[PDB]
C-alpha cells in the first residue's frame, strides 16, 4: 500500500529540477524583455526638443 | 479592455508633432503676410506729399 500510495502521489524530481532551471531562464527572459518594452517609450522625446 | 480603450483614444505622437510643426510655420507666414498687408496701406500717401 505504502509503494503504491509513493508511485501515485510522489514525483520524479529530476523533470522538476529541469523546469526549475527552465523557468529561471524564462524569468530572466521576460524580465529583460521587460525592461526594453518600459525603455522603448522614451524615444518619442526627440523630436520635441 | 484597457488595451481597447487605448486604441480607441489614444493619439499618435509622431504625427502629432508634425502638426504642431506645420501649424507654428503657417503661424509665422500668416503673421508676415498680415504685416506686409498692413504695410500695404501706407504707400498711398505718396501721392500727397
Not at 13 to 25: D, G, I, P, Y
Not at 27 to 45: E, F, K, T, W
Request: hydrophobic residues 40%; without cysteine.
Amino acid at each position: 500500500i505504502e509503494s503504491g500510495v509513493g508511485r501515485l502521489v510522489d514525483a520524479d524530481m529530476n523533470e522538476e529540477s529541469t523546469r526549475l532551471k527552465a523557468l529561471q531562464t524564462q524569468q530572466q527572459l521576460a524580465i529583460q524583455a521587460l525592461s526594453i518594452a518600459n525603455s522603448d517609450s522614451q524615444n518619442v522625446l526627440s523630436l520635441f526638443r
